[PDB]
């Protein structure tokens, strides 16, 4: 198999840069249209991260920052598969996540919300997907967070995630939400996405058969990245 | 066929997850950073630095930047590089940094990349691929950094020449300076407005 | 009958000037709103073109540029009626058309697509409508054309057309497409038109009873221009 | 696994031999019913074709007959999978295709249609499916073709194909059409197939993510052959 | 009642159909062009020229322009002109041109028009109606060209006075020059941005 | 479970794709044909020839025919043959031909096949499987060719005996002739009407 | 205007020749398909009948055979328009009609039905259409008629008609029925027509505003013939 | 667009309306008939006669036949004839007849037609267009009658040569005979079965 370029990003499946309902996008969006280019080796390659450098608790947000006791909050496991748009598993991709604690408070200098800080919770983790594109991490469910867009704006509970995979063209950062959260319907950040089906692609689903008795709940969440086409005739990549 | 998962802003606390040290969180033994030069890395060492400005001309003090580039011979440290050439074994090709919360300055310590093959037998001028994430930015913005001392190579570069508004090509060229024997390329990014930086859909 | 002004152009029936999905419109659209004016003789008059100057093959795109043989491609006749919005026929209007060849290639210096050029095809024609507002021309069906908006953008097969009629206010340039072409649903240029019914007004329909056996297919396509109102009281035009 | 016979051909999924709307079938259809037989080694075996004999451009209809330049017309890639009725891939099957050029003209002595011949297009190709049952070829989209059934009859654009696979009982010749072609609904040859779902099984679908920018469109078309049942008790084949 | 057929951009190859000569296609014996002056045409000969600029200040090199105007006595060569006056018999009143592919300059050879009646007994200052089509322009843009040497007539013009932002009126006035005895009016069009040209919905 | 792709006629130009030489198209270096005898092929060489007639008694001059058969020892050159016997290594077992456009005659050069096992321990008489495709024929028609000099084997053949109308069995028997030392079997096919050839659903 | 050929007859809009439910068609239908030809002057021309030869009562079936009194039965006027398939009126076409009397009895040697003969009714008329394609005749409504197809078969009330118009290709004979007759749904002759919409095209509609008080009812029935296409390019007719 | 009114059989009493005399109904002063020869008609007088047979070989005794043909110079007495030649003024070109109720014989008295132009500059052999209506016939059947003494013209006739089954062409040729100085062409029509007459969709 000789690989060609990644399929074009479908801009109608993503938010636009300028989205007035999300106020800080007004000054941080280009006024010119993006210039599309034909891909070269620069866009189809990406770095490789060795598992050797990852610690044993890097994917365990419940214990990786625990000092004197366990963090307070709802114990949950999140797992799923990362695939490309043609359904192929994405192997050894770097998945990084970060989130607030159970109070909706981020361990960040710029966060002054009154929700209480948890001395035993840090809020970040990472992991590599396996050969089947599977990932799994454990954490405390985050609480919704007020913020100033309109004065009484509230983000639904969410976990931020980032993927570095096989090609630079696949680079993606997004956020996932939890099935049933009523704030999902009012969030101006989620509403920057044009279609209802795409908004639903960011909701992690309760996975009841995978809850661990007397211990933790579980949510299932799959991620889809851009995929490469195969070439059978002229190979113009180089 | 499936649709790509939709992008969402990284938000103001993107550092917790991607640069925990900048947020004062020591949970990882190995931390990813903005230093791509290892002791045995080949090539000329350069420093790439600048600021990112919003539409009012103010720097973003919460922006996160990553770069991806080839080694000194123009080979990518990636299994997807098909050149059949051996890459420098002491080079990741990637780095990540955040703008300083007070000044807005960002920087990387890296190596000047070699020229990489373009499509259909062409040759690309030396460049570093760069992406920007921040509160207010719904999808990471892609751009490239070329070097003002590679004028001849830049003039023949396929991607630069694919920008039909010739006046905008200059926003992608960093300026070479020399602070105490060290070579520094300054590349400021203007997200919106006059002299707006070119952004690509790749 | 004393004619008054043309009816106001209904801006909601046309694309807006700024339409971000069609990238080159971002820098080529005014930021100020259009200034509407009350019509004068300047807007209600237009030039007259005499049939005497038109050659015998001006409406025959199959033969008007043929040198050594016939052009390659699907032989088709396109015909229809030009009417004003109140249903009156538009007589002696100048209709000019242009298009790519069967490969999706334009005979233009700025077109470098790999689709092959056809030495026996030019791609332009013209004709005057008759007293019933009828027009008819023959051509080769054009092939769809890739272009750089997003990197893998493709125009559906289309024929560009222009009308100069009775009043300068009627001046119009547009494009028509062919029934059933699947690219119609994905074209960002066609999507600049706000309503689905107006997008459908640009699709030429297969006209099976008018195919010419063992020779050519036929498509029917009608065009509607702005119409003049009649005046029965004060005539303020002059 | 011990293989038994191929499953019975479902005659209601195919056209009947006598189909009066397709006039030449009136004298070329048996009046007696077909005699069904129980299969023997003669029906479950078939020949093997070695890849060694195939040239490098046998599946490239754009270049395999090109002499002075490229053929005129719409560049398209067609690909898909050949499976048996129980979903198993059909490996190393011989797929042969033939079609008219962009004008609807066949390079055949008996074709006198006025659509122009293309000196750089031949119209035939072949290929072997791979281990996943996948095939891919590139060609120029053919134009619809008038023919004399009723005097003004027109075939929709189509590509003829033939498969020789694992068993003689699977031998099949058919034709596929292109999504959206309006002639599909009027063709008496396609209407010889009794059911609407089976008529739809011959329509190749636009595969937009697999178009190659500034180069070629792509259509996806899968083929299903009869499948063998496995035997777990008496093996009466021999 | 029927709806007007919707407009669509002319696209980048608008020349194939409207100015085949500029695309090097000789299929017509009679070709429409930018010369409205015939040998016996009455009036003072003038040259109208300029460039069309996009929002970056760059000229459009693929733009197509048409003008429509009255003869020297202010009568339109159209059956819809109701003045009851005889029009110059050697004047079409219309012309078409394309910007040069390299420089972006466009021009017409025509005659300075006479004043035409306005509504309700008013008098319009001398003007030429102009329309612009190009890739990127979804509907032809209408504007008018007035003449700076008709200051008194311009001051009383109904349409100019209907523009309430007085500062924008000046974008519609062409500047008179004199290149070798020839009178030339320069009229640059700015589609977007500073000093943006006024466009009308007519 | 999936449904078989529906059949459609091969149409009048079936030669372009299946016998390009007959249509004068030289695009393939190796061309499939009607000669199954290689120099080292084992067995007695025979020529099989005939015409295909429509319901008016007229020959089809646009028909395409293929045959599939076993080698001289009754073994098929196919991985699906389960006899455990070695097949002749210089025998494809398959061939394709078209009727002549003028006369309607078709022929193959092959070998007389050996007897092949039938179901449940029976033995089939020597036969060649044949399929016909043409304009007007919606699904390829399958038949078999047996040999008149194998009367004893034919009388015990399972498939022939499964035809309950005994009078139709004879339409499947080819007649042996001898043109200049060469053995020729003549097999005419009558698609419709009197003495209509038996066709099988296999 | 230069006229070309008549549009192809749409065979799916007419009954087939062999229709086993109408028993006498079994031996009077060709077994071979019809051979379609391209039209010549022979097919596009037809005879002209002068109005001068028609008597004053030729279109009045109530009085044209009346001897001693008026025929018995329901007085009705039938009128309508003859148009071609593109909607143009058919001028000066010869329309001939015939039917049974009020008892369902035909004045024909071969009719032995017991329904009574009417000495004052003949049952045939003719007329030429006018310049608008209009025709009008007056008659007695016919009674339904038993016949031997199956033993208890009954034709709904009907009037037989024939048209000779502008081209021989338009030659047509058919029958029309009366709105609401319950036998329409059971007639095997009407059921030879494949589609329900075409069966409805033979039903004359009650036209109540055109009844003539204290005198006659009225039925409206329009007829559509094949139409000629116009030629704008090559004229191959001769 | 409208659909053609569907055809229905003429039925067994087609004579009441189309040949009232044969049904003994005298309601019309002028009656259409099978005599196309007027006293001043130009050309050679011929008699065309025959029978129409059903699938059992039995004559139809209730069939109605019409013919349409050109005059002696090959011009049609129709406004749609575009030859620009003057037609014989004493010739209708059309006639109608019914088979005799007892014998099934039908006939016309007419003139042998001249050759008429075919498409694309060709010439048609002399022919008469004929249509048949009857109980059992759902749509009138169209055929043509050519003449056996015009062998050379018949061989070059476009329509006859468009019949690909050459053996069926002969069913369209009438046989010339001579009964008492009168020239008679015999043309039997076989609706179904052996030697079935060719019918056209025109
Ligand atoms: Fe957050
Ligand atoms: Fe275009
Ligand atoms: Fe075909
Ligand atoms: Fe009747």
From Swiss-Prot, chains A, C, D, G:
Pathway entry: Aromatic compound metabolism; beta-ketoadipate pathway; 3-carboxy-cis,cis-muconate from 3,4-dihydroxybenzoate: step 1/1
NAD in keyword set: no
Catalytic activity reported: 3,4-dihydroxybenzoate + O2 = 3-carboxy-cis,cis-muconate + 2 H(+)
One BP term from GO: beta-ketoadipate pathway
Pfam families xrefs: Dioxygenase_C (PF00775), PCDO_beta_N (PF12391)
Names of the cofactor(s): Fe(3+)
Assembly and interaction partners: The enzyme is an oligomer of 12 copies of the alpha and beta chains.
Family: Belongs to the intradiol ring-cleavage dioxygenase family.
Full protein name: Protocatechuate 3,4-dioxygenase beta chain
Organism per entry: Acinetobacter baylyi (strain ATCC 33305 / BD413 / ADP1)
Highest classification ranks of the organism: Bacteria, Pseudomonadati, Pseudomonadota, Gammaproteobacteria, Moraxellales
Name of encoding gene: pcaH
UniProtKB/Swiss-Prot annotation, chains B, E, F, H:
Cofactor(s) this protein requires: Fe(3+)
Cofactor: record remark: Binds Fe(3+) ion per subunit.
A Pfam family that the UniProt record links to this protein: Dioxygenase_C
GO biological process, one term: beta-ketoadipate pathway
Catalytic activity: 3,4-dihydroxybenzoate + O2 = 3-carboxy-cis,cis-muconate + 2 H(+)
Keyword Transcription among record annotations: no
Key words of the record: Aromatic hydrocarbons catabolism, Dioxygenase, Iron, Oxidoreductase
InterPro entries linked to this entry: Intradiol_dOase_C, Intradiol_dOase_core, Intradiol_RC_Dioxygenase, Protocat_dOase_a
EC numbers on record: 1.13.11.3
The protein's assembly and partners: The enzyme is an oligomer of 12 copies of the alpha and beta chains.
Described purpose of this protein according to its UniProt entry: Plays an essential role in the utilization of numerous aromatic and hydroaromatic compounds via the beta-ketoadipate pathway.
Family as reported in the entry's similarity comment: Belongs to the intradiol ring-cleavage dioxygenase family.
Name of the protein described by the UniProt record: Protocatechuate 3,4-dioxygenase alpha chain
Organism: Acinetobacter baylyi (strain ATCC 33305 / BD413 / ADP1)
Source lineage: Bacteria, Pseudomonadati, Pseudomonadota, Gammaproteobacteria, Moraxellales
């Amino acid at each position: 198999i000789i690989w060609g370029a990644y399929a074009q990003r479908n801009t109608e499946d993503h938010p636009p840069a300028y989205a007035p309902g999300y106020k800080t996008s007004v000054l941080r969006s280009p006024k010119n249209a993006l210039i599309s280019i034909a891909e070269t080796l620069s866009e189809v390659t990406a770095p490789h991260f060795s598992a050797d450098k990852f610690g044993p608790k890097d994917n365990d947000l419940i214990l990786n920052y625990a000092k004197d006791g366990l963090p307070i909050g709802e114990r949950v496991i999140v797992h799923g598969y990362v695939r490309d748009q043609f359904g192929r598993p994405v192997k050894n991709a770097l998945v990084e996540v970060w989130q607030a604690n159970a109070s909706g408070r981020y361990r960040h200098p710029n966060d002054q919300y009154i929700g209480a800080m948890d001395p035993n919770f840090g809020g970040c983790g990472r992991m590599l997907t396996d050969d089947n594109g599977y990932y799994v991490f454990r954490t405390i469910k985050p609480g919704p967070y007020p913020w100033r867009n309109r004065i009484n704006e509230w983000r639904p509970a969410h976990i931020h995630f980032s993927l570095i995979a096989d090609g630079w063209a696949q680079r993606l950062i997004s956020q996932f939400y939890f099935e049933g959260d009523t704030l999902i319907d009012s969030c101006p950040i989620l509403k920057t996405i044009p279609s209802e089906q795409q908004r639903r692609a960011l909701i992690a689903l309760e996975d009841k058969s995978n809850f661990i008795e007397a211990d933790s709940r579980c949510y299932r969440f799959d991620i889809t990245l851009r995929g490469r086409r195969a070439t059978y005739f002229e190979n113009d990549l180089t | 066929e499936l649709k790509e998962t939709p992008s969402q802003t990284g938000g103001p606390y993107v550092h917790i997850g991607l640069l925990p040290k900048q947020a004062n969180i020591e949970v990882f033994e190995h931390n990813l950073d903005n230093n791509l030069v290892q002791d045995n890395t080949q090539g000329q060492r350069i420093r790439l630095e600048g600021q990112v400005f919003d539409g009012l001309g103010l720097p973003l003090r919460d922006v996160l930047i990553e770069i991806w580039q080839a080694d000194t011979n123009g080979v990518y440290p990636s299994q997807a590089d098909t050149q059949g050439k051996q890459v420098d074994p002491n080079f990741l090709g990637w780095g990540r940094t955040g703008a300083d919360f007070g000044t807005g300055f960002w920087s990387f310590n890296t190596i000047k990349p070699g020229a990489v093959p373009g499509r259909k037998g062409s040759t690309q001028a030396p460049h570093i691929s760069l992406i920007i994430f921040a509160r207010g930015i719904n999808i990471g913005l892609h751009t490239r950094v070329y070097f003002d001392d590679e004028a001849e190579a830049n003039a023949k570069d396929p991607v630069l020449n694919s920008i039909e508004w010739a006046t905008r090509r200059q926003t992608l060229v960093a300026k070479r300076e020399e602070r105490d024997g060290e070579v520094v390329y300054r590349f400021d990014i203007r997200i919106q407005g006059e002299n707006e930086t070119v952004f690509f859909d790749i």
